[PDB]
Structure 1
Amino acid sequence: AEYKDNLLGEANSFLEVLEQVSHLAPLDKPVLIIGERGTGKELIASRLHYLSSRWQGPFISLNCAALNENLLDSELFGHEAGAFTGAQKRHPGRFERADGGTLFLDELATAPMMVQEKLLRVIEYGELERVGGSQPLQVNVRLVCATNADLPAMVNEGTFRADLLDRLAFDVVQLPPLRERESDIMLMAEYFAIQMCREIKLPLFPGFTERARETLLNYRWPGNIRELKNVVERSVYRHGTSDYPLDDIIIDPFKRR
């Protein structure tokens, strides 16, 4: 039906990952993504939510690292009454966001052991933890995961229990590295340059330099995110009135002179 815009690249690994996502799309099982920092695993997860979930299924992007107070993390589970300073109205909504949908998280490494254990004791049985006194709800919610650290690495560290690590990781979706892609990286760079030229509302073509491409190849670019491409496009944007830009700045503090 509707396809989100994606960068064009000759990366058969990306196509295989897409095909695997399509295969797991009819399936309703936990999905784990091995995406590193800046790999845009969130975009892949959303694309899955387009197909893996039922059409127009609820989606929610809550990061456990974003949680401020572990008490609020408890509040992330529904509270009936008598919680916190004001118990007048209580609706966590996260389980409501969970209900009729999937669960997507990023960098699930930082969670406290209790948080992870509660998550296991909720997901595996399907029942919902309630902060206030109430019968738990067996909300049918899928689970999708995307983290940088190796699952065996945490197992050696012991952060995730064997039951928790296993039941958490049913399918593995390795995200290709940006440094892994070279030609597909260049094609996606050109596509992002075109998109940025459209966004900046500049009719003139952006243009590129061979030395700039060589330097970009030299750049580590650990994050395959549009953010690194956006930084490149901003370095281009610092130059104007020339059909093809020359050179670029790695960082604003860099080359301050």
Structure 2
Amino acid sequence: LGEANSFLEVLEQVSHLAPLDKPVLIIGERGTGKELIASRLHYLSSRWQGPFISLNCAALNENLLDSELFGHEKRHPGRFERADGGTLFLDELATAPMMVQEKLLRVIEYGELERVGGSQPLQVNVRLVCATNADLPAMVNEGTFRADLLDRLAFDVVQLPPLRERESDIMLMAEYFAIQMCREIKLPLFPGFTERARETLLNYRWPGNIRELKNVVERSVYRHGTSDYPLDDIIIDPFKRR
């Protein structure tokens, strides 16, 4: 979400990339909306009526990631199969082991999964979107990411700006989230943010970006719990005994 110029530029970029069949790499921090951008690419493409499938590479160990992406065998179809005719979004790409990476490059270059057991190779037709916040070029240098894979995945790159670089959007989205929380708890009006609250909001780095902002603001509104005076206490850390 948001209206900072750097974010509008991302939306404009997405509008031009979506119609292509080429892979897209999204670089962004947690809570910047990577999967929502991936979804947007899908729905603005010619594949929009096909499936949108997502997988977080970081969540699974090596053998389970391999099975989940490429399938195993009557059969457990993998995510490439499930995304046939549509788009597959792979999050936390940097965590894919080197074996998975080489297999993925093959799927990209040849357009088919390999198969054992008398079964013919499975043909797939999938538009790929990946995301990470790693420095992939730095990983190539270290030997932890495949140069050949990154020589192909990154047809183009969509860089999502962290919230701390979109200070205009911080107060805009904070207001939006505060209003929704007021509705949820049945306060008549959002009474505003004090200048001390605004300083707290604008000074904080938001490592968790929009997701974190929404959480902080919702909690803060709930703890404040009144429309009679402006919200002064922004509860960044729920573990503090405030």
Q: Same fold (TM over 0.5)?
A: yes
Which one has the bigger helix percentage?
2
Higher mean displacement: 136-145 or 157-166: 157-166
| Structure 1 residues 90-125: Cα deviation after superposition (integer angstroms, max 9, x where no partner) | 222423322111111111111111011111111211
TM-score (norm 1): 0.84
Check conservation: 1:74, 1:131, Cα contact below 8 A: no
TM-score, normalised relative to structure 2: 0.89
Q: Which moved more, 1:90-99 or 1:157-166?
A: 90-99
Contact 1:30/1:170, CA 8 A, preserved across alignment: yes
Match of 1:42 among 18, 35, 44: 35
Structure 1 residue runs without a partner (length 5+): 1-7, 81-88
Per-residue CA deviations over 1:139-166 (Å, capped at 9, x if unaligned) read 1101101100122111112222221111
Displacement of 1:32 after TM fit? 0.4
Deviation at 1:217, TM superposition (A): 1.2
Overall identity of the aligned pairs, in %: 100
Tell me which of 140, 148, 167 is aligned to 1:182.
Answer: 167
Q: Does structure 1 retain, via aligned residues, the 8 Å contact 2:57–2:65?
A: no
Q: Alpha carbons of 1:105 and 1:225: their partners in 2 closer, same or farther (altered >3 Å)?
A: farther
**Counterpart-to-counterpart distance in 2, 1:50 and 1:40:** 15
| Partners of 2:216 and 2:234 within 8 A in 1 | no
Contact 1:75 1:131 survives alignment (8 Å): no
- Cα displacement (A) at 1:251: 5.0
Determine if contact 2:18/2:45 at 8 Å carries over to the other structure: yes
**Higher mean C-alpha displacement, 118-127 vs 186-195:** 186-195
Distance 1:251 1:217, change over 3 A: closer
What is the Cα deviation at residue 248 of structure 1? 2.2
Secondary structure class of the residue paired with 2:127: strand
Give secondary structure in 1 for the equivalent of 2:52. coil
Structure-2 separation of matches of 1:119 and 1:171: 17
- Contact 1:103–1:144 (8 Å) recurs in 2: yes
Q: CA deviation at 1:192?
A: 2.1
Q: Retained in 2: the 8 A contact 1:197–1:206?
A: no
Distance 1:206 1:124, change over 3 A: farther
Distance 1:72 1:33, change over 3 A: closer
1:251 aligned counterpart, secondary structure: coil
Give the CA deviation at 1:56: 2.2
Preserved contact between residue 69 and residue 79 of structure 2 (Cα < 8 Å): yes
1:99–1:206 CA distance, 2 compared to 1 (3 A): farther
Change in Cα spacing, 1:56 to 1:194, as seen in structure 2 (3 Å) is farther
Q: Which range moved further: 66-75 or 38-47? A: 66-75
1:212 Cα shift?
Answer: 0.6
Residue 53 of structure 1: how far off its partner (Å): 4.8
Greater CA drift, 31-40 or 200-209: 200-209
Would the alpha carbon gap of residues 141 and 157 (structure 1) be closer, same or farther in structure 2, given more than 3 Å must change? same
Q: What runs of 5+ residues in structure 2 fail to find an aligned partner?
A: none
Aligned counterparts of 2:16 and 2:227: Cα–Cα separation in 1: 47
Q: Structure 1 pair 173/131, CA: closer, same or farther in 2 (3 Å)?
A: farther
Alpha-carbon separation, structure 2, partners of 1:161 and 1:95 = 20
Deviations, residues 17-50 of structure 1 (Å, cap 9, x unaligned): 1111111121110000111222221111112221
- Which protein has the bigger strand share? 2
Separation of aligned partners in 1, 2:159 and 2:149: 20
Using the TM superposition, give the Cα deviation of residue 79 of structure 1 relative to its aligned residue in structure 2, in angstroms.
2.7
Inter-partner Cα distance in structure 2 for 1:119 and 1:152: 18
Of 211-220 and 196-205, deviating more is 196-205
Superposed CA RMSD: 2.2
For the residue of structure 1 that corresponds to 2:205, the secondary structure is: coil
